[PDB]
Write a protein that binds this DNA or RNA. Structure first.
Lengths: 97, 112, 80, 94, 107, 18, 106, 89, 82, 100
DNA sequence: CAGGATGTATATATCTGACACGTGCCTGGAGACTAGGGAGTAATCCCCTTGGCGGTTAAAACGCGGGGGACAGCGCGTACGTGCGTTTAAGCGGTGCTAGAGCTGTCTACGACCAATTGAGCGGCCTCGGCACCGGGATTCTCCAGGGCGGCCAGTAAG
DNA sequence: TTACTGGCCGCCCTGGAGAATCCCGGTGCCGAGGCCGCTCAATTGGTCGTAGACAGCTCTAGCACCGCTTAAACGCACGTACGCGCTGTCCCCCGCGTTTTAACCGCCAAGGGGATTACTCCCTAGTCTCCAGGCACGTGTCAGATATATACATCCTG
């Protein structure tokens, strides 16, 4: 059969995403994630369907920045695959710990 | 200056004092303003090897070694400082360089 | 709603990091990213609720989340 | 030629919580500039709160919402529990 | 009538009056309620009554009576939540909190 | 060890001195 | 005497008046000088007269006449002199500038 | 709502290009943020100098702190034109 | 007029910092590199510092000014002036 | 033969790490710093005069910025599993922060 | 190198939901006129930076070995990505319901404002104890030369 | 024939020999702080004007649910690229004397500019009155979304 070598589809998956702006996190599983967090801060909240978006477009970006920083940390450590060591370092160095 | 033949090869040294052993009382430049040389009686605690003491004797300070570590020499060990006397140290130093390497061949033979 | 953080899938994270620029994502990330995202929302919401709880409202509207995000330094644009 | 400061106050509190300790100048001018920092964040926060909700004035509540945002964690639940205990005592004593 | 200072009635140590002016002068809002200063002095007086008692208990451990910035820098970075409040602040003459990564230590 | 705070007590004790 | 708007008198397009009323009510200071808002109106123009410029070119080079929020995210993240002004801010629906580190590429 | 104002600019700089109803939102949310940063910095700048009133010179100095590099040059070059033009009439 | 002062930050003074930082072995290139960073950090703080000084028309850069230029960039300072 | 009793490479630095973190004085030498600041400001506006403290306030911040850098470049150097920091880390630890 | 297979990019055509323009409207802004309070303008003075002088010693520069980490190479084995097949639930489009957002009107409690009053917190003086400093022992820390200890063959005891 | 203990090489922890650091006992030094006028800002007693607290009401927008298509998730298989652990090599930085240097200290000064007042002035806040530009809503062509169907583009795989 025909198969792409490992990695060749990865790059094709990047240029197919870094060129697009559509939301990546699935919406209805996010809505139920925000509600779960709001409970232990206050009960019976009601979110405007806009204010669930404004959270998603924020928490998507936060992560994409974090992943760029971890990719830098891994290219630094001389391996290609990001790992939790890289996540924790890219957060510690930011001081956002 | 002075140079002290220590076993195989000498090293760089500095004349700490100048002493006439027949006088049995040494003259040294004290430590610090310039400290003028003083003729002092040979220390009883101070021990002299004969080679230094037959002819004019002098305690030395080695360059690179700490004063507390610094020790005595004979006079046969001392040849007046000369670039030719520095060369022979270097030839021995080069001869000491592969000396560690020549021993390592037995370690090379030990590992293999 | 016992476990919804398990709802942010493995392909969800994989899709995000693919936008980020990575190539190979090690297995322990897919769990560990959830730990980061969670502790992000617990800070953004806990602020958004406070603005709401102050105005006596019972709805966390977008004009709140934009404010809560602003103090975070992560200013947001497009909503108010 | 007067530059008013909190040097008297911080020093008074210090005797309440360490009846022996005293504070040195260069350490005071830190506290004299830490308060002037917090008091510029809290107030500067309950200045945007009132503005957002379109209320013109700044009242105590607007400070609770200002504290519970800046002071992180256990301080938030102790400050506001220390604030109200004051303001309640004040009004009841007036 | 006899004058009772407003900082007394609140029981606070910080001055409530001096704050009540600062809110007006700093132009934080067009009007300032009478509840804000009393509430704002307490919070301040609480925090300043926190860093100190911590700094103090750091002083006694270094066998010095007086508080000096080195004690303050130790009182703030050790605590986890005060440090988070002053995350960006840099204390003059402060020194650093002693920390050596475990990988560097000899073996 | 010569310079130590030893971190006696961290969790808040709300103004027992009051 | 017919009323002439301050914005039109100054030749600008942004509302000098609306900026002026905003400066008063925001409680920035007790008094606002006469020349303060007109100066701030111009500074506001030139910041929009440049972001809308760079984004305007993004439309052409991308062949879509209407500027969509991505065309903003390409106008600012390309230009360094602007990016630092917009360092912390996120733009919704903006995506990211496309790049991949050299080690990744085969 | 700075949107009518923004359109007037865009239709000037680009007589053909249009703007989506979300970009306006970006700009209406953007201009307000820059205005707040500048006017906010301007207020703090007058307070440090004990001055009571925000004036023409306060905003100019408030700009050169925020706008980086080349923008500081042309913005203050633009601002001075407006005041001189306004003061002309 | 002043010239060539950046090399005044003595090479040990780079390690003496780095010790307090907590690094053990320092490569050869760091020294020449760090000056490059510190010089960038001053041209930021000093500038913002000068601008206020120009603003109040006062020639001498007041100690209170530097506390402000720092406060704007995000590195607040405690104890100097206030 | 002839041994000067030199400490092991690595244990003088740790020692003097333990000596500086404990201490608190200023490290960058005062006067050669002052002649730097006067030289930088001489560029932005000629013929300035610096108040005494205003020079001190800088050095107090310029130190505690670098120290914040090294304590963060080290974490990058530990990361590649090596000990010696290197300019390919201060180039990292400044781009992670986004300050660039 | 040669060549099929693949994916994205590219063209033509078909709808739409959506942004651009029209039109009415009313609310904020422009005209006009002060008023006093903030801001500029002039000596002045003094205190406080810049500047020079010389001793002096703490420290920076410099030199050399070698000890250990930087780095390159390599073997590898497993935790990855890729693809298929199945199976979830996400998204879309409605139906119906109602908390509650937003807005009105009423008017009372609250805060701005002011004159007179007074004591809190200011600057200035002065002092003596907390503490930096130095000295020399006592004590701890580190480095290293000499030193008991399993892993092998050799000759062991022998089925 | 098989079988396997002993001997010699294998190779540690441990004392010492220093260096570094702590302890403590004086020994001045200066600023922490206590005290003293006093003044000017906080306090008190009163009025006035309205911001918002409060109550009621009109509709939006959100929540709940649900049935259908189908795209995304999930699990399994597999094959191989890479993280990593090991070895080896060498260069380069730490350690520690020497040798040079310029920071520092203390000391004097000079004049420069930041900090008061006096004065005087002129500019913006406040107010009243009139109207047209910005806003909201309506609509109506229309550029972009969308479906479908070429034209190369890279990717392997020999």
């Amino acid at each position: 059969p025909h198969r792409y070598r490992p990695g060749t589809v990865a790059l094709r998956e990047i240029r197919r995403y870094q060129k697009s702006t559509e939301l990546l996190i699935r919406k209805l599983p996010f809505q139920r994630l925000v509600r779960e967090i709001a409970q232990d801060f206050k009960t019976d909240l009601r979110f405007q369907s806009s204010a669930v978006m404004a959270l998603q477009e924020a928490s998507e970006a936060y992560l994409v920045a974090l992943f760029e920083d971890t990719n830098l940390a891994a290219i630094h450590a001389k391996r290609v695959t990001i790992m939790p060591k890289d996540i924790q370092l890219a957060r510690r160095i930011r001081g956002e710990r | 200056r002075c140079l002290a033949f220590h076993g195989p090869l000498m090293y760089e040294a500095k004349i700490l004092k100048i002493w006439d052993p027949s006088s049995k009382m040494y003259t040294s430049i004290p430590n610090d303003a310039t400290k003028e040389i003083k003729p002092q009686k040979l220390g009883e605690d101070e021990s002299i090897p004969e080679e230094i003491i037959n002819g004019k004797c002098f305690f030395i300070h080695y360059q690179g070694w700490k004063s507390s570590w610094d020790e005595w020499v004979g006079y046969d060990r001392i040849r007046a400082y000369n670039e030719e006397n520095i060369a022979m140290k270097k030839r021995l130093a080069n001869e000491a360089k592969e000396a560690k390497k020549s021993l390592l061949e037995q370690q090379k033979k030990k590992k293999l | 709603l016992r476990d919804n953080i398990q709802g942010i899938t493995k392909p969800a994270i994989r899709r995000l990091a693919r936008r980020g620029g990575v190539k190979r994502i090690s297995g322990l990330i897919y769990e560990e990213t959830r730990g980061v995202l969670k502790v992000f929302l617990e800070n953004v919401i806990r602020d958004a609720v406070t603005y709401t709880e102050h105005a006596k409202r019972k709805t966390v509207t977008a004009m709140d989340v934009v404010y809560a995000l602003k103090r975070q330094g992560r200013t947001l644009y497009g909503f108010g | 030629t007067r530059k008013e400061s909190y040097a008297i106050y911080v020093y008074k509190v210090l005797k309440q919580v360490h009846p022996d300790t005293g504070i040195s100048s260069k350490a005071m001018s830190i506290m004299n500039s830490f308060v002037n920092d917090v008091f510029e964040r809290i107030a500067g926060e309950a200045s945007r709160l009132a503005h957002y909700n379109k209320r013109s004035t700044i009242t105590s509540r607007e400070i609770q919402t200002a504290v519970r945002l800046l002071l992180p964690g256990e301080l938030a639940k102790h400050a506001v529990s220390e604030g109200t205990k004051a303001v309640t005592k004040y009004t009841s004593a007036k | 009538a006899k004058a009772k200072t407003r900082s007394s009635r609140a029981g606070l140590q910080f001055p409530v009056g001096r704050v009540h002016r600062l809110l007006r002068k700093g132009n934080y809002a067009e009007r300032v309620g009478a509840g804000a200063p009393v509430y704002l002095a307490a919070v301040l007086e609480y925090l300043t009554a926190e860093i100190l008692e911590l700094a103090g208990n750091a002083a006694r451990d270094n066998k010095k009576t007086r508080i000096i910035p080195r004690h303050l820098q130790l009182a703030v970075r050790n605590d986890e939540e005060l440090n988070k409040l002053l995350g960006r602040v840099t204390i003059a003459q402060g020194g650093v909190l002693p920390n050596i990564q475990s990988v560097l230590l000899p073996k | 060890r010569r310079k130590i705070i030893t971190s006696e007590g961290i969790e808040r004790s709300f103004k027992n001195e009051h």
